[PDB]
Amino acid sequence: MREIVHIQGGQCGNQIGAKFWEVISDEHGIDPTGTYHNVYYNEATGGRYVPRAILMDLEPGTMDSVRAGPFGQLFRPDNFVFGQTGAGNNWAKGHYTEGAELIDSVLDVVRKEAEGCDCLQGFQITHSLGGGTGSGMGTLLISKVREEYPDRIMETFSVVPSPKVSDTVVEPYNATLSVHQLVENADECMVIDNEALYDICFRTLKLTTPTYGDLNHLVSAAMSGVTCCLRFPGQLNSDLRKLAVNLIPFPRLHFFMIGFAPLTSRGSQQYRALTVPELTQQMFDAKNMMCAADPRHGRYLTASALFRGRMSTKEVDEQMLNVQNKNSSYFVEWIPNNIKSSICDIPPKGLKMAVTFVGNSTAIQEMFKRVAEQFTAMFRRKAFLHWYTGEGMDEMEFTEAESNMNDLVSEYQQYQDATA
Amino acid sequence: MREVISIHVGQGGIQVGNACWELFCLEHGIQPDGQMPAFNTFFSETGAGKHVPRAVFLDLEPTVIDEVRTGTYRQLFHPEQLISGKEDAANNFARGHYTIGKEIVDLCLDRIRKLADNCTGLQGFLVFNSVGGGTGSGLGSLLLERLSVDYGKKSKLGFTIYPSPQVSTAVVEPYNSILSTHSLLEHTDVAVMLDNEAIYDICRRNLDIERPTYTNLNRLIAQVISSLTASLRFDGALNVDITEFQTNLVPYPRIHFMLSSYAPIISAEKAYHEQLSVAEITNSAFEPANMMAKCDPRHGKYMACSMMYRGDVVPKDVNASIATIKTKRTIQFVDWCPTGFKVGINYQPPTVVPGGDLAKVMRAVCMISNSTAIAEVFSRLDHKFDLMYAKRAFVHWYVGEGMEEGEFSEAREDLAALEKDYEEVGIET
Amino acid sequence: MREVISIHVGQGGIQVGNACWELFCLEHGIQPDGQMPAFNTFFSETGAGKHVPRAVFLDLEPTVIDEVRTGTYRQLFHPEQLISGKEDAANNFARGHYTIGKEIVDLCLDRIRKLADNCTGLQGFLVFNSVGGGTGSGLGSLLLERLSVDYGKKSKLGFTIYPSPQVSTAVVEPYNSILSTHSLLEHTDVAVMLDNEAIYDICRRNLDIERPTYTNLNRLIAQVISSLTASLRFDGALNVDITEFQTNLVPYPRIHFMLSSYAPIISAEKAYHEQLSVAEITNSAFEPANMMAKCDPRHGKYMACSMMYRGDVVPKDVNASIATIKTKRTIQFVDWCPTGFKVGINYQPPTVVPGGDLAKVMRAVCMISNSTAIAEVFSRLDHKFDLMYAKRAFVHWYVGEGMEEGEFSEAREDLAALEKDYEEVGIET
Amino acid sequence: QGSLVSWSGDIKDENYWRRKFDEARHATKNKKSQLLQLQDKLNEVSDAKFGAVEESPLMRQIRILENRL
Amino acid sequence: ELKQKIEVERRQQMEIEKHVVDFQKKIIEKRSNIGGKQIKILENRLDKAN
Numbered sequence A: 001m002r003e004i005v006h007i008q009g010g011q012c013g014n015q016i017g018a019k020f021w022e023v024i025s026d027e028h029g030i031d032p033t034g035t036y037h038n039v040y041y042n043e044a045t046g047g048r049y050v051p052r053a054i055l056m057d058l059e060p061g062t063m064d065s066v067r068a069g070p071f072g073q074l075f076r077p078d079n080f081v082f083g084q085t086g087a088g089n090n091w092a093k094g095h096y097t098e099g100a101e102l103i104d105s106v107l108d109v110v111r112k113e114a115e116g117c118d119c120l121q122g123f124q125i126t127h128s129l130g131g132g133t134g135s136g137m138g139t140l141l142i143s144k145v146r147e148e149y150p151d152r153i154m155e156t157f158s159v160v161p162s163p164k165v166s167d168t169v170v171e172p173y174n175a176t177l178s179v180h181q182l183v184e185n186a187d188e189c190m191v192i193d194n195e196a197l198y199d200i201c202f203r204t205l206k207l208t209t210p211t212y213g214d215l216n217h218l219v220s221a222a223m224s225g226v227t228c229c230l231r232f233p234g235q236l237n238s239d240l241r242k243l244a245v246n247l248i249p250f251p252r253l254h255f256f257m258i259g260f261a262p263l264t265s266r267g268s269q270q271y272r273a274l275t276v277p278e279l280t281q282q283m284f285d286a287k288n289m290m291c292a293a294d295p296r297h298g299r300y301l302t303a304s305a306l307f308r309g310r311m312s313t314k315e316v317d318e319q320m321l322n323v324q325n326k327n328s329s330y331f332v333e334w335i336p337n338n339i340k341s342s343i344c345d346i347p348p349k350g351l352k353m354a355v356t357f358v359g360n361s362t363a364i365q366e367m368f369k370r371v372a373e374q375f376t377a378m379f380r381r382k383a384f385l386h387w388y389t390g391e392g393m394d395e396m397e398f399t400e401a402e403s404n405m406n407d408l409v410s411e412y413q414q415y416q417d418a419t420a
Numbered sequence B, C: 001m002r003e004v005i006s007i008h009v010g011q012g013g014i015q016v017g018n019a020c021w022e023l024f025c026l027e028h029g030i031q032p033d034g035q036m037p038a039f040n041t042f043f044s045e046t047g048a049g050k051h052v053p054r055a056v057f058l059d060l061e062p063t064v065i066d067e068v069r070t071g072t073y074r075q076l077f078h079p080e081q082l083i084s085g086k087e088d089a090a091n092n093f094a095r096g097h098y099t100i101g102k103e104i105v106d107l108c109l110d111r112i113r114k115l116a117d118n119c120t121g122l123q124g125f126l127v128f129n130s131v132g133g134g135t136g137s138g139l140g141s142l143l144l145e146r147l148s149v150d151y152g153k154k155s156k157l158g159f160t161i162y163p164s165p166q167v168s169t170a171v172v173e174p175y176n177s178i179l180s181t182h183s184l185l186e187h188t189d190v191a192v193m194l195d196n197e198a199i200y201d202i203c204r205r206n207l208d209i210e211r212p213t214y215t216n217l218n219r220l221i222a223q224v225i226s227s228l229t230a231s232l233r234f235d236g237a238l239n240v241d242i243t244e245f246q247t248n249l250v251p252y253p254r255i256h257f258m259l260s261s262y263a264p265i266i267s268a269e270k271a272y273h274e275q276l277s278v279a280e281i282t283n284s285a286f287e288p289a290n291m292m293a294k295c296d297p298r299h300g301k302y303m304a305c306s307m308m309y310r311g312d313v314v315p316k317d318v319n320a321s322i323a324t325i326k327t328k329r330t331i332q333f334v335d336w337c338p339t340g341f342k343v344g345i346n347y348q349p350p351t352v353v354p355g356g357d358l359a360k361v362m363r364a365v366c367m368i369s370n371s372t373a374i375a376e377v378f379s380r381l382d383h384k385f386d387l388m389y390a391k392r393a394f395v396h397w398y399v400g401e402g403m404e405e406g407e408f409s410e411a412r413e414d415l416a417a418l419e420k421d422y423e424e425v426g427i428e429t
Numbered sequence D: 001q002g003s004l005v006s007w008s009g010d011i012k013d014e015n016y017w018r019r020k021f022d023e024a025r026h027a028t029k030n031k032k033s034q035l036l037q038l039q040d041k042l043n044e045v046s047d048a049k050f051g052a053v054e055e056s057p058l059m060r061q062i063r064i065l066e067n068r069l
Numbered sequence E: 001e002l003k004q005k006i007e008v009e010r011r012q013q014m015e016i017e018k019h020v021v022d023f024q025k026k027i028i029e030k031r032s033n034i035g036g037k038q039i040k041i042l043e044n045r046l047d048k049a050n
């Protein structure tokens, strides 16, 4: 049981959710038709399994496109929360004028899906920080669900403004506005960025003609591997809360980087062996992360690992022992045995093993600082402001968002080196 | 007459109990059907002439629970002895002892209530709680509390699995373990400790299998426990008493944390080539490499030792092995206990499981000892606890669940009181 | 009662021991299975009524080791008595005694530790180390050192194979041999030397086979050793004592390097045509062409001689052969030893191996003698050592492995002290 | 311009860090073996090793019983 | 820029590692130094005279 509800947001979040449901259907043996050929699905007369997946957005072209592609019959025709105007890359648009009139349609449907279960252990949001809709609308949904349900655990698979270029000109504004309302009411922010995702699909995988469905498939395989330890048996099982405890020692430093494995070349997929020491090499390799922040330029406040496949436990023991042994000061030493380990008992579709590494570390603080830097630049010199200020927002909130980001990062950095 | 109850609370204890019962049936001759083609201590009567165990598998996370209820061993357990929660304790002590413990405690108490009503001659309890997780820490602590406030007079032998010396399957292990030690003191009348490193070394370089796994580990623990309970199950030459165990291995109610050992652990490939004499096995008996836990034999001065002989054992080889071990200087005892040896002979050889690495041999011995070395495990747990408590880590996970902050420290110096006494009792005069 | 331990260290000793045990089983009636369809000295008890030898095959290079562990004789040896290294000693003494020796020495000491614990009545050791290679030199030296510092009281008979007089399978033989001689003095209480030229001549023009090979050589050494250990294995007429061997063949602890000989070595093709009388065999006994090592019988003045008679031997032919050899001038003894003869009769004829060139005959005799001729082998080794040491050759191979340079010289004049004493003891008065 | 100079300096910093880790772990493992061997030394050195065979109580038994005989 | 901290750390750890190498040497020398039952049989010797 121990339910999940899959609310989406923005065209990004919509595509990622579509492909994630594709992956979970293809894993649980669910067709695009919705049969078997409940921890994620719901029973429906006629022998159907409907995903309790809500797609909300301020534009329907995304809605139409996600309906059009394969696996579209999964989502039932009520959870398509239709927006007609579009926030148009404006946090004020996506959070105040259209938020405060979409909140409650979403409230009725989320109460729908929440009473549909018995025990809703955790939520599920995938959205953006830069798009007006995604950012504002999504952090507003987060605030609302965290207002009524204080006992659940919040979780966002969040895409941030890209380093080399900003996807939309107001990426800094929307991103700081999203994090300022993310810190207190979002319990686990898995930080992803389109550029690092590009890097991981490019470097070791031969992919020369990539596509957004491809990156969605990658991050959705990761998104399935993070929790696949829940719905399946295992010698040493976990959940969202053992993970949350072993990951956050403080309610603030709870933003996590994620990676999934294995991922190698296909033409070279035969020449290499395939073992668990090789899995450790694969992801404790710096380049295998899904965030534009090499974690070995910082420190690991703690890190959790979740296995998939049936091998021994001698493995995971020597695993985190060996890795702590050499990359010790790459972690933080003020906390004992900062690596947590669990095992899911089932391997992936067609392959032998899977591994998911999640990390509560202090290298995303530079991501936060680069966001705040771009923000402050466009902010003092007043770049792209009337779009936010002529729609019932003031820059007092912008100042406080920027300063709050800076406060978060100041704790991140001092907790990097705090020792006793 | 003698009946013994076993709780398998947590995810560690529940798998240890799965292996315990999977070995108990094959030893007593019970097939997994509940059908059998003495057993007084473990197996009850159902009015149709077949057996249902007197044990309860309790755990917050229901995964291993449906594993056992739809596996192959469904026909043994009673549906009344398998209760599941829909959540966990998040590896913190407060969620398993304060929040989610209270609605499972009364159900478990009613089940064991009626189960102690069911059997006539209860003699002892066995709590199986790997303290590393929130359930095996807090819910097991609360279970032991209630067991001791209801029953009290009856002995309790806890096979608690501490957070391992440096390896760990969780980071917040140091908190939810020191807090369980408090209840572990009073309630667990005698506590046979477990850790992971030593059984890993044993399974790797003793049975020559190159990946040791948890199923093998739990099978091996079940074999040790079979050597433990054979004396009451089957008839022996000089039968020992489990209440004699307490009166001989608890010199003071302050020193009752005890460790164990087993011989022989050998593959068939070296069993065919070894002699394995009665005197020879008594050497690997106190071998420090054979040690089952993270304790050093020369760290502790032995205060009490019980030897469990099973198979074709003649008493005089036992008596001469005692002489040779007491002669050679490599072992020593506490001065106040001039004779701290108690032996028990049993004419039942160890039974064999199909599909096990373990080898059938004539003679088996199991050591269980109250010494003063365990204080090192105590201080080593205190290491991680202080290293985490000095910096505020995971404190919110504990206080946001009905727990005050001072319990961390009170449990820390509680286990420090054990460390103090364990070195104050074992000195010269 | 009497048990004897054999180390076969190096690549020479390990093959000599392969042949030793392959002959021992066929003699005692043991098949290579470990099954037999007395043996007290060599064969132990496994509790299933079958035998595992009391010996260890040690070598840095693991090639011959996996040869024996996947050959046809796997069922005999215990997996505890076969330890392998992953490297060599590069034929230099320092890599086998200083660098790679230290992590194998304690394992071998623990194995023989427990093995001397296993057998009850140990009586002697036999070290089998062809010193030509780095292992058989340095690791064998260190093994003998540890054997003598742990055991001490017990006799050690070393069948060391020196670098051959002029032939050589290695060039750096002169260094790593003189350095082993140091430890060979104190530790190897009695040292029966071996070289290659004489057994080559024997196998070529004595058994008439035209290519002698190492398997035949090791089989022949095993036959000599069978004639040696028959007295303790099987019952004889006048049984001899291996501690009498020392007290009669070690007139001074400075002269204990001894040589050997065997008769008859004859093919069946001349055994059918020869009479081979008891008196006749005693002539080829001291024949200088029959000599087993590079020693000249008229070079040394015999100080002690032990004769090993086996088969159908009546004592008076023995006594009259002693008379005739002491009468004729071609032999002579030291003046201080007026009677330096000790004989041992045995009613067990030599057993036959299928597939051997060796012929079955009624009477066999084995000579083992402490004389003063061995000093020529000593000086001949010193030849090559000085010729190499005078020019700096391979010095780096030794000093880059934790060795100082002066040990070369200290070992050179160490063996020179033997050469000195061996001529100072055997003069007139 | 200076950004690539900083890049190269940070490659040097990465190498330097990596090194410091190698040598720190070597130091740890060496110290652990050294402590192991030193404790082996302190327990192997007996507290009655100077008198390798003394047993003074039974030496007194020896002398008094010799006088007796 | 900020590298001298890790350089002095390397110097410290290298002095300490070679210093524990000296330690190890000292301990192996002391092991080689230390490298350099009859009571009951004497009671048996007493039995005969009594």
Ligand SMILES: Nc1nc2c(ncn2[C@@H]2O[C@H](COP(=O)(O)OP(=O)(O)OP(=O)(O)O)[C@@H](O)[C@H]2O)c(=O)[nH]1
Pocket: A235, A236, A237, A238, A242, B010, B011, B012, B013, B015, B016, B059, B060, B061, B088, B089, B090, B091, B092, B096, B130, B131, B132, B133, B134, B135, B136, B137, B161, B168, B169, B170, B196, B214, B215, B217, B218
């Ligand atoms: N010996 C042994 N130990 C086990 C076994 N299974 C789990 N463990 C140990 O149990 C520890 C965790 O204890 P648990 O209380 O069972 O963890 P949990 O069930 O997830 O508890 P929660 O965190 O509240 O969900 C791990 O660190 C393991 O070392 C087993 O089968 N045999």
Ligand SMILES: Nc1nc2c(ncn2[C@@H]2O[C@H](COP(=O)(O)OP(=O)(O)OP(=O)(O)O)[C@@H](O)[C@H]2O)c(=O)[nH]1
Pocket: C010, C011, C012, C013, C015, C016, C059, C060, C061, C088, C089, C090, C091, C092, C096, C130, C131, C132, C133, C134, C135, C136, C137, C161, C168, C169, C170, C196, C214, C215, C217, C218
């Ligand atoms: N009699 C006899 N001598 C042998 C036999 N095998 C090897 N030898 C001798 O052993 C000498 C070399 O000694 P070893 O110590 O075994 O050489 P090694 O094993 O290669 O030693 P490393 O150089 O350290 O690798 C050779 O010169 C041979 O004369 C054998 O089967 N019988």
Ligand SMILES: Nc1nc2c(ncn2[C@@H]2O[C@H](COP(=O)(O)OP(=O)(O)O)[C@@H](O)[C@H]2O)c(=O)[nH]1
Pocket: A009, A010, A011, A012, A013, A015, A016, A087, A088, A089, A090, A094, A128, A129, A130, A131, A132, A133, A134, A135, A159, A167, A168, A194, A212, A213, A215, A216
């Ligand atoms: N991973 C992923 N990211 C996307 C995809 N489509 C858009 N994005 C990212 O999402 C951001 C757009 O945010 P969004 O809220 O959807 O825009 P809005 O709907 O106009 O407010 C851009 O910065 C893109 O980089 C996709 O298919 N996959």
Ligand SMILES: [Mg+2]
Pocket: B010, B011, B059, B060, B061, B088, B089, B133, B134, B135
């Ligand atoms: Mg649990």
Ligand SMILES: [Mg+2]
Pocket: C010, C011, C059, C060, C061, C088, C089, C133, C134, C135
């Ligand atoms: Mg070699």
